[PDB]
Design a protein around this ligand. Structure first.
Ligand SMILES: [Mg+2]
Ligand SMILES: [Mg+2]
Ligand SMILES: [Mg+2]
Ligand SMILES: [Mg+2]
Ligand SMILES: [Mg+2]
Ligand SMILES: [Mg+2]
Ligand SMILES: [Mg+2]
Ligand SMILES: [Mg+2]
Ligand SMILES: [Mg+2]
Ligand SMILES: [Mg+2]
Ligand SMILES: [Mg+2]
Ligand SMILES: [Mg+2]
Ligand SMILES: [Mg+2]
Ligand SMILES: [Mg+2]
Ligand SMILES: [Mg+2]
Ligand SMILES: [Mg+2]
Ligand SMILES: [Mg+2]
Ligand SMILES: [Mg+2]
Ligand SMILES: [Mg+2]
Ligand SMILES: [Mg+2]
Ligand SMILES: [Mg+2]
Ligand SMILES: [Mg+2]
Ligand SMILES: [Mg+2]
Ligand SMILES: [Mg+2]
Ligand SMILES: [Mg+2]
Ligand SMILES: [Mg+2]
Ligand SMILES: [Mg+2]
Ligand SMILES: [Mg+2]
Ligand SMILES: [Mg+2]
Ligand SMILES: [Mg+2]
Ligand SMILES: [Mg+2]
Ligand SMILES: [Mg+2]
Ligand SMILES: [Mg+2]
Ligand SMILES: [Mg+2]
Ligand SMILES: [Mg+2]
Ligand SMILES: [Mg+2]
Ligand SMILES: [Mg+2]
Ligand SMILES: [Mg+2]
Ligand SMILES: [Mg+2]
Ligand SMILES: [Mg+2]
Ligand SMILES: [Mg+2]
Ligand SMILES: [Mg+2]
Ligand SMILES: [Mg+2]
Ligand SMILES: [Mg+2]
Ligand SMILES: [Mg+2]
Ligand SMILES: [Mg+2]
Ligand SMILES: [Mg+2]
Ligand SMILES: [Mg+2]
Ligand SMILES: [Mg+2]
Ligand SMILES: [Mg+2]
Ligand SMILES: [Mg+2]
Ligand SMILES: [Mg+2]
Ligand SMILES: [Mg+2]
Ligand SMILES: [Mg+2]
Ligand SMILES: [Mg+2]
Ligand SMILES: [Mg+2]
Ligand SMILES: [Mg+2]
Ligand SMILES: [Mg+2]
Ligand SMILES: [Mg+2]
Ligand SMILES: [Mg+2]
Ligand SMILES: [Mg+2]
Ligand SMILES: [Mg+2]
Ligand SMILES: [Mg+2]
Ligand SMILES: [Mg+2]
Ligand SMILES: [Mg+2]
Ligand SMILES: [Mg+2]
Ligand SMILES: [Mg+2]
Ligand SMILES: [Mg+2]
Ligand SMILES: [Mg+2]
Ligand SMILES: [Mg+2]
Ligand SMILES: [Mg+2]
Ligand SMILES: [Mg+2]
Ligand SMILES: [Mg+2]
Ligand SMILES: [Mg+2]
Ligand SMILES: [Mg+2]
Ligand SMILES: [Mg+2]
Ligand SMILES: [Mg+2]
Ligand SMILES: [Mg+2]
Ligand SMILES: [Mg+2]
Ligand SMILES: [Mg+2]
Ligand SMILES: [Mg+2]
Ligand SMILES: [Mg+2]
Ligand SMILES: [Mg+2]
Ligand SMILES: [Mg+2]
Ligand SMILES: [Mg+2]
Ligand SMILES: [Mg+2]
Ligand SMILES: [Mg+2]
Ligand SMILES: [Mg+2]
Ligand SMILES: [Mg+2]
Ligand SMILES: [Mg+2]
Ligand SMILES: [Mg+2]
Ligand SMILES: [Mg+2]
Lengths: 15, 244
RNA sequence: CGACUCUUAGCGGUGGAUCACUCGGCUCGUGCGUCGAUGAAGAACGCAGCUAGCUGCGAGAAUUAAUGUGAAUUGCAGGACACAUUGAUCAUCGACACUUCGAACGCACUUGCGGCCCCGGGUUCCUCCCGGGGCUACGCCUGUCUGAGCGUCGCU
RNA sequence: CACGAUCCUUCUGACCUUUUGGGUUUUAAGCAGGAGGUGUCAGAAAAGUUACCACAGGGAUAACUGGCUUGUGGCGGCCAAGCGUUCAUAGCGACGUCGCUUUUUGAUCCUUCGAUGUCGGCUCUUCCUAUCAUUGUGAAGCAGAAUUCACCAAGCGUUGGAUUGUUCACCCACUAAUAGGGAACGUGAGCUGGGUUUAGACCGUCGUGAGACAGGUUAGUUUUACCCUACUGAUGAUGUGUUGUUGCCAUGGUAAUCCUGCUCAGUACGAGAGGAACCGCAGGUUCAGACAUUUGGUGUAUGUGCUUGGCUGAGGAGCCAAUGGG
RNA sequence: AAGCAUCGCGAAGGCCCGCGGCGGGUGUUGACGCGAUGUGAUUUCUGCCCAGUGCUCUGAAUGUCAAAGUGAAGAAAUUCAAUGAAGCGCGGGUAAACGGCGGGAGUAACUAUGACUCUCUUAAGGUAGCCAAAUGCCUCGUCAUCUAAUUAGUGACGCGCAUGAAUGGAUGAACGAGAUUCCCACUGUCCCUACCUACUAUCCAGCGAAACCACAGCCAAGGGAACGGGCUUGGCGGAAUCAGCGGGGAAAGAAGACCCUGUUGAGCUUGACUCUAGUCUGGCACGGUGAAGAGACAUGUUUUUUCACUGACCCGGUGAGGCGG
RNA sequence: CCUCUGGCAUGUUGGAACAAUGUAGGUAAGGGAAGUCGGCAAGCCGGAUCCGUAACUUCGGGAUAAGGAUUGGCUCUAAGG
RNA sequence: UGGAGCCGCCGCAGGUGCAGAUCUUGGUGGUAGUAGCAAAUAUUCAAACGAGAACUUUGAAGGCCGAAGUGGAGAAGGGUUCCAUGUGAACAGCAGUUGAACAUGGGUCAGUCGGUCCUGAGAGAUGGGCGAGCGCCGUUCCGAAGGGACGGGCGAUGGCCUC
RNA sequence: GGCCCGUCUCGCCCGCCGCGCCGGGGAGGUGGAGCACGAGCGCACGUGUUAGGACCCGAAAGAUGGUGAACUAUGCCUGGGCAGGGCGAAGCCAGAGGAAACUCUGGUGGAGGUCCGUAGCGGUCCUGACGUGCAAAUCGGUCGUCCGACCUGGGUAUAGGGGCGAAAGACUAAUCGAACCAUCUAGUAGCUGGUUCCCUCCGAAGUUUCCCUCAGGAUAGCUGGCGCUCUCGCACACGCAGUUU
RNA sequence: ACCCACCCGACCCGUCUUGAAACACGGACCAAGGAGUCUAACACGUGCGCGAGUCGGGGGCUCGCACGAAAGCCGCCGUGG
RNA sequence: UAAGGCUAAAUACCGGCACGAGACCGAUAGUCAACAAGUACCGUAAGGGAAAGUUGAAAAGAACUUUGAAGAGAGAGUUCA
RNA sequence: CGCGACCUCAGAUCAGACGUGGCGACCCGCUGAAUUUAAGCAUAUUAGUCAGCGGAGGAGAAGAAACUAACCAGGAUUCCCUCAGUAACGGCGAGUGAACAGGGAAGAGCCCAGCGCCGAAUCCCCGCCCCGCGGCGGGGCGCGGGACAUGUGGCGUACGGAA
């Protein structure tokens, strides 16, 4: 399927 | 975790010695009636370079005393050997340089190299580059001789076992600085895969016992037992004293 | 009314559900219970008048012989045969045959190099050269021949 | 209230039972009662770390928003002992007291863990007023000038920089003034990514160590709009019989701003020092709406010179070099 | 990385492999070498601490310490005894081994600091150096300088939250797609935007996907699982579309990396618990010959000690070529 | 960068327009980093010959340091075998 | 409509009733005639064939690659892609009279060019050892590891038994 | 009330082939899943509870045996490749000075993990392009390096708790803090999700105690189903209650 | 029961949840498939047979089994449970 | 009566050859496989592994006419259709 | 320094035989987990189970008591029913777990070494004849080879055996 994001991007980041 | 570099050198594979261009082993002549009782004469046909070795060698050719046949050897060159020289060897050999004779014959204070550790072994002690042994003292009964090795140790030896008079050629090699990493690279390439060496402190803690940490430190004492399983025996092995 | 949109129905598309079939499976049972250096299984490459695949066979290659059967085979051709004759076509299968790899065997895996005996051309055993044929794995047993040993003796 | 199951051990107890084909003896095994302990006390035998991390799930549970609350912060009354030379209240206001506010921080955990992109700045619009300035006014401990206090009031404004990732802060400068906030602490398919907050590394402190640190440092991928709406503009739509005309106007929107100089005038006022204002007149700020006569900018009219390297044999005439260059 | 510095090993050895082998790698090697660690060119230095944890050296003088072996009593299973290996303890060394390196009071004819003194304390109590550093909490430290203005930069200062000497300290020319700060130049970075070119986007012919999709798609307020497209009450609502746009669909993407729970895990660590290859020691076996002597018990037995011997076993040499008489 | 030999048909299409946004190029008056976390981006500089070259230094470097001047076309001269 | 089997009652039996499982397999929409068919400067005129030409071919012009080539030959890899004739369904993201598509046939000739031989790093039998074992180790190491040759002698046959 | 077995306490007698450390009884308590004129066995259906793949789907992991070094990591063998400039190290020549030591000046010479810079190898910044791409990592400019620890073909070696690592837990065929393939395997799941026709009747709980228990069990409670035993509106009722007296 | 109109009523289902129209997840649409099974053991309830008994296995005797791998019978009828 | 040995039978049988049957499945089922299936296809390799049945009783499978370059049609015909 | 016995060992493309791989449902010998259960886990369990290696047959293995028992005694092995979820094992937890008897299916028992006796009375291979020859056998005849006294054959093996 469609790529979307990189492995280390992990979109909605909230640490 | 991992098998550490060090444990891996035992399996050979990549860490075996490089030996294509090596010119041969650097033995002594094998014993026989002539060596044992008189002295066989040979001539130094050439002096040679042997990759991965600081000592130069000497093609020395004799005559086989049984078949019409010119046998040849590779002596490690005693310093001051040259071509078109004769190289006598045996019991009744004359005590001059580049002349292999039993330690029992030669007097005290006599400097030798390529010295047989056990009679008939063909030349095992003191064969490095600037190195030699000195014949200390003889015990006529017991047929034994005391010899001072380059390490300092004063080993006991059979008076029968032979040595070439004089020191090894190419001495003082290690006085020259290397300077270039390149110059190091080129040294060990004609030997074996042992060069650019990575400090266990650098490594992650799976590949070395000093590894890991937020600071490149050892964390444990760097001295260690020698009743130590291979994988820990790292740093200073059985270190009697450790400092300066 | 106009176009467009929504709804229903008719007919047509798309799609292949349903139903109905079944030379396939799944399960249970019965009898027998058989591979191979006399070259297995497996693989390879071949072989049809037109044939690619599946099958069937091995340079005698969709098969030969034999026996049983008794007019076909058939996509088209062509043919045969006298189907009052060992005789088409199937079936069986006891005779014959069975390319190359493979335990795989002269040694190698290039399909490369050989040795040794015999035969035909080649010679006129002149060895060559070419072609054909038969041998040339390892292990082991029973014997056979040749041997080895300051192994144990005997006679000289 | 002051204490402890099974299993195991240990001690005590009977002329006790069994110890297996029978008998004797040691041994062991039973039966019955105490003791040896499980405090996570109805009773596993048990150290860390992970920022290299994983999986099952959880809004039963944190880290935002938003709710409730308002202690805390912010703002505002009431009372009136005082201050204010004198005089509670021009301006203030103790000891007490009553409130509002959600631009502070806490409580809390209702929503979201099959993810609502986590700070700041930029950019843009709109609202609020708890009004810094500007208009109109009441007050003074308002002579003038400067002023603080209050009212109507949010129309129009509220800037340029140095340091800092900053919010915040501070400083310089100008100004009429450099008021304060809100919009998911407005705004990442708007950017940016400096900072927080993966992985690489350094330092300090801590840790035996792996590693830790609202301790410092440096390096580190910022995806998608063609759907629907909203907004912007663009064709059209139903009606009027068709068509064209010139028109009206329901409803929406809406805009102007503040300053200087001159004059009044060294005048009023004032002991003086200082020092206004209304009407005029001349201009400027910010904003808005246009426009190109002029100045400037662009310029591939590829217009016209000039020039490099090359190429049509040369001249002349040209071309090529992603717009050859000027 | 060169350079420096430690450490192990003379080969029946160091280090290491391997399931096993008279196996293998280093090694066609022998300390100017092989192997194991640190530090990191040069210059200049490299202080003190062996208490702790390591490592190591010695060893009948000796606490404990297993199996076998020896004695003991017992009818025997047995029990008890003496004996006693490494290892622990006991005693030396070692910091270019891991590492570590203080705190009170008083004191100088203005004050202030404190050279000086006094204690209490450790294994020493941080030496040379260096500094608000890539290391300083307070912190935007203080002074100076750099600017009109500097939470920045530089230079100084040093009870330094929590600097510091091969866990290397201080330095330093050359070098660096390394981290800062300023100046000159240069510029549309900006004041402040503008015009031009090409390819797009646009319209057309031909061709023609995808994600996403409960239904859908105008607002205000209300209540509501405490931020509604749908509900209530209001405002309101007019076909079909085009180019744009990023406010909203808490848009899409991926069963949250954070956090917490699970009696789910994995990577790594060690003073976790339970084991284990390896290694070190002791016993029995292959394991023999002779000499001598020496104790212990007994009035022969056992323990054997040392010194030889060679025939097992091992190692080395060689085309097993001259060995012993 | 332009050319001959040889090779191609502009890289899976064409046509018409020349809007906004872009992607890739350029240019800008006056100022010159006031922008921004930060001169990011772009701009300056650039070849050669002739001068001239600092601190510091491991004496080797630094060094194209910095900072200057010249450069075309044409017609001659002199010097090198 | 369809064209060959099927039902009621009494009992027995079960792989017995779907809207959901980010369910499985297949199909179909809206999105949409939308995004899109924009890297590397470039095309134009005439003719031929042809049902039909923006794209084929020929000619003419204008352009590019610019000998570190968009030129001329190999290695590996492909495996008939090569050449010719024909087709215009499908495929070559427009078209095609074209193609590496499809269908018919053709097509690779060696003493000397290479494989072939050698040894390299290495691989690997035997002997030997290990091994529960398929086997492994080992490659000169615990091997009686040479089958060859010359000259002489003696025998045997095959040949003008001469040589 | 009684009887049987275990057990205790107290007691007094009987028996005989073997008189005994023999055997038998009595009274009174008390433990027993006992007896006290039997109810089981077999077959069938239903519900519940378990063990099994056990309602269906779902891990991260664990184990055994095999396949890969065509990418990449490192070693080894054999081949190939690297414009044009700058700086100008040793050595050498001449000239000048120097009494000597030797020193200056001009040349020549061409050193170097030397500088610029092409091919090559790389991959800094634009946090540019692209981001349902040309591309599952590409493009453009800008950059680093370019005689050496240089680049590179083929051959060859090392294999999974293993390799290889100038060390980033890097790389090991788009996969690495433990590769891939098949099996053990339908691994386990106190946790998500789903769980298929109608009517009818009854109809809860979130509280108990225990639990390495707190997102789960156990046990009480609350529910349903099956009943039974009786009662009397069949002029002829006892008992019971979320009351009150 | 097809379409249309009008008045009133009327948020989208599934699900976990104290609470869902939710700004909680799953769901574009349709077809087919798709989840409490079987074995064993226990317990209680119910139905049947026999009853101080009951029992059937296992084995055997009767058939080539068409229906049968059934059905029947057994001093085994009870070794045994 | 151990430290030596041989031995049919009742017993086992998801592989093979050859048969028989079924309260089974009926093409998303039943074996992966009703068909040119361990096929195509993928993967360096170990290994992975599909989809896919049905004209009609008979091919009687549409002669011929016509439009079109053709695919496609329009009539005609075959068939109970 | 010979020749000859034997012993222990080699080499033959010596004569003639055999073994090698496959299949693997069942069978024999080794080897041997971990998911899993215990609501955690380490013993236990999963399990002598999967994977691994070896070797077979139509079946294999087992088998003619160094057995059971404790009786008034049974009498090889295998199989079924039962014993029995019992005795026992077990963090005596989870869980695991046989045997004899009894009834059936079937039913079958034997041979060496030794100890002894018997002229090795025995065996293999050659070669000639007659039959028989697609599972190489019978009979005869050979001063034809060899094995064998370091022991072949007949009698005989515990139920006794020999003379
Ligand atoms: Mg690291
Ligand atoms: Mg470790
Ligand atoms: Mg319709
Ligand atoms: Mg289908
Ligand atoms: Mg007894
Ligand atoms: Mg970390
Ligand atoms: Mg952390
Ligand atoms: Mg790390
Ligand atoms: Mg909550
Ligand atoms: Mg007063
Ligand atoms: Mg809050
Ligand atoms: Mg959002
Ligand atoms: Mg107000
Ligand atoms: Mg916000
Ligand atoms: Mg937004
Ligand atoms: Mg974004
Ligand atoms: Mg950052
Ligand atoms: Mg980091
Ligand atoms: Mg568009
Ligand atoms: Mg001209
Ligand atoms: Mg160009
Ligand atoms: Mg060190
Ligand atoms: Mg110490
Ligand atoms: Mg420390
Ligand atoms: Mg100090
Ligand atoms: Mg600044
Ligand atoms: Mg400073
Ligand atoms: Mg320190
Ligand atoms: Mg020190
Ligand atoms: Mg430190
Ligand atoms: Mg909504
Ligand atoms: Mg939006
Ligand atoms: Mg989202
Ligand atoms: Mg989740
Ligand atoms: Mg997850
Ligand atoms: Mg719990
Ligand atoms: Mg774990
Ligand atoms: Mg421990
Ligand atoms: Mg173009
Ligand atoms: Mg084109
Ligand atoms: Mg192309
Ligand atoms: Mg400008
Ligand atoms: Mg600014
Ligand atoms: Mg600035
Ligand atoms: Mg720049
Ligand atoms: Mg400089
Ligand atoms: Mg029909
Ligand atoms: Mg069924
Ligand atoms: Mg459905
Ligand atoms: Mg378009
Ligand atoms: Mg060509
Ligand atoms: Mg062609
Ligand atoms: Mg096309
Ligand atoms: Mg129950
Ligand atoms: Mg179940
Ligand atoms: Mg699973
Ligand atoms: Mg585990
Ligand atoms: Mg980018
Ligand atoms: Mg895009
Ligand atoms: Mg393209
Ligand atoms: Mg793992
Ligand atoms: Mg399941
Ligand atoms: Mg739970
Ligand atoms: Mg009820
Ligand atoms: Mg829940
Ligand atoms: Mg909740
Ligand atoms: Mg709901
Ligand atoms: Mg809501
Ligand atoms: Mg959920
Ligand atoms: Mg959804
Ligand atoms: Mg269905
Ligand atoms: Mg019952
Ligand atoms: Mg047997
Ligand atoms: Mg089908
Ligand atoms: Mg089908
Ligand atoms: Mg099927
Ligand atoms: Mg069907
Ligand atoms: Mg059909
Ligand atoms: Mg059908
Ligand atoms: Mg019909
Ligand atoms: Mg076999
Ligand atoms: Mg468990
Ligand atoms: Mg569990
Ligand atoms: Mg666990
Ligand atoms: Mg077991
Ligand atoms: Mg198995
Ligand atoms: Mg048998
Ligand atoms: Mg027996
Ligand atoms: Mg028995
Ligand atoms: Mg029972
Ligand atoms: Mg068991
Ligand atoms: Mg006998």
């Amino acid at each position: 399927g469609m790529w979307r994001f990189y492995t280390e991007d992990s979109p909605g980041l909230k640490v | 975790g991992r098998v550490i570099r060090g444990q891996r050198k035992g399996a050979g594979s990549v860490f075996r010695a490089h030996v294509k261009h090596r010119k041969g082993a650097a033995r002594l002549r094998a014993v026989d009636f002539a060596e044992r009782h008189g002295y066989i004469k040979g001539i130094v046909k050439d002096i040679i370079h042997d990759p991965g070795r600081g000592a130069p060698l000497a093609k020395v050719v004799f005559r086989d005393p049984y078949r019409f046949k010119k046998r040849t050897e590779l002596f490690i060159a005693a310093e001051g050997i040259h071509t078109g020289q004769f190289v006598y060897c045996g019991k009744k050999a004359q005590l001059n340089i580049g002349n292999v004779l039993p330690v029992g014959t030669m007097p005290e204070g006599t400097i030798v190299c390529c010295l047989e550790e056990k009679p008939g072994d063909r030349g095992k002690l003191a064969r490095a580059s600037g190195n030699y042994a000195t014949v200390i003292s003889h015990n006529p009964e017991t047929k034994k001789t005391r010899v001072k090795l380059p390490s300092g140790s004063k080993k006991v030896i059979s008076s029968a076992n032979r040595a070439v008079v004089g020191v090894v050629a190419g001495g003082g090699r290690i006085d020259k600085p290397i300077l270039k990493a390149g110059r190091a690279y080129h040294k060990y390439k004609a030997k074996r895969n042992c060069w650019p060496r990575v400090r266990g402190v650098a490594m992650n803690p799976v590949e070395h016992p000093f590894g890991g940490g937020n600071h490149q430190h050892i964390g444990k004492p760097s001295t260690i037992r020698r009743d130590a399983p291979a994988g820990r025996k790292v740093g200073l092995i059985a270190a009697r004293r450790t400092g300066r």
